[PDB]
Design a protein around this ligand. Structure first.
Ligand SMILES: [Ca+2]
Ligand SMILES: [Ca+2]
Length: 313
């Protein structure tokens, strides 16, 4: 059987509807998003900053465009500026400042097609942002998801400002991650297709250039849910929240079947993120709509925001 560890989890904060997108900025501040917040049945998602000591929450942004509320669901911190890139299920891709101001990156992609709602994203070390888009067209267009139909797409927002659809026909693409060589070269993209219990891989040949698509890993279980958020640890092991399984799966560098499983004190882990330079992993979950933390066996893989702009001196 696959080895299972049961680390001690510590509650961080609660009352976060749809708790998702955990992320640390360049100053070490912690943020999470609340995509499930609604006001009178209408989307009113929030981006919050969490005090690690008290667990107190501060709403920094409640995105809305032309009267349509956003559904912020995933985040990545930029490197050269302390700003957050946020995947929004209703607005697409947003760039949010610590002061709460935000900008919608694109209404349409590089081919002029209306943008699809986004769920999560991952920066590669070259500054390109790989994004999952499981939702239908962004507001004002009517909402819809790809849990059944295969119209979920993947985008790559390049450093040159191009929003390129790099693949599509996915059944609710969710988590996403980029594997790098030790010299910093991005070479593999991993995409979670939630309901199908599959993790897909592609070889990265350059900015917005992916090929050799294949099924890379298998997510355990027949439960409703599947792979949600993911991140690499420093040894390139891929940790994946398996929503509905009560576990976070751990895949070795070669994928396939998980090499280890991490038991959680809740059934629906949605996402995770390492605290910089530590073995501490923060986990968002939908059973209690809260955030927790636990200690992993090693530090996490550095996020783009922690990398050296000029290389190793
Ligand atoms: Ca997600
Ligand atoms: Ca993460």
């Amino acid at each position: 059987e696959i080895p299972v560890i049961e680390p001690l989890f510590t509650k961080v904060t609660e009352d976060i509807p749809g708790a998702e997108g955990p992320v640390f900025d360049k100053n070490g501040d912690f943020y999470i998003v609340a995509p499930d917040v609604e006001v009178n049945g209408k989307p009113a998602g929030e981006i919050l900053r969490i005090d690690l000591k008290t667990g107190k929450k501060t709403v920094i942004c409640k995105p809305e465009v032309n009267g349509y509320g956003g559904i912020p669901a995933g985040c990545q911190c930029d490197r050269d500026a302390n700003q957050l890139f946020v995947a929004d299920m209703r607005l697409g891709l947003l760039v949010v400042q610590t002061d709460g101001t935000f900008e919608e990156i694109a209404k349409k992609d590089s081919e002029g097609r209306r943008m699809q709602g986004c769920n999560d994203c991952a920066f590669d070390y070259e500054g390109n942002l790989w994004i999952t888009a499981p939702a239908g067209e962004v507001a004002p267009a009517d909402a819809t998801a790809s849990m059944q139909e295969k119209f979920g797409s993947i985008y790559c927002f390049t450093t040159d400002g191009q929003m390129i659809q790099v693949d599509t026909a996915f059944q609710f693409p969710n988590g996403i991650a980029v594997r790098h060589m030790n010299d910093g070269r991005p070479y593999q993209l991993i995409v979670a297709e939630m309901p199908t219990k599959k993790l897909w891989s592609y070889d990265i040949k350059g900015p917005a250039k992916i090929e050799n698509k294949k099924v890379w890993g298998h997510i355990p279980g027949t439960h409703e849910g599947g792979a949600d958020g993911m991140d690499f640890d420093e040894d390139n092991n891929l940790l994946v929240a398996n929503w509905g399984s009560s576990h976070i799966e751990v895949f070795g560098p070669d994928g396939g079947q998980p090499k280890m499983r991490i038991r959680c004190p809740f059934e629906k882990p949605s996402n995770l993120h390492f605290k910089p330079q530590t073995k501490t992993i923060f986990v968002t979950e939908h059973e209690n709509n809260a955030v927790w933390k636990f200690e992993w066996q090693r530090n996490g893989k550095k996020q783009y925001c922690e990398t050296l702009k000029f290389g190793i001196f």
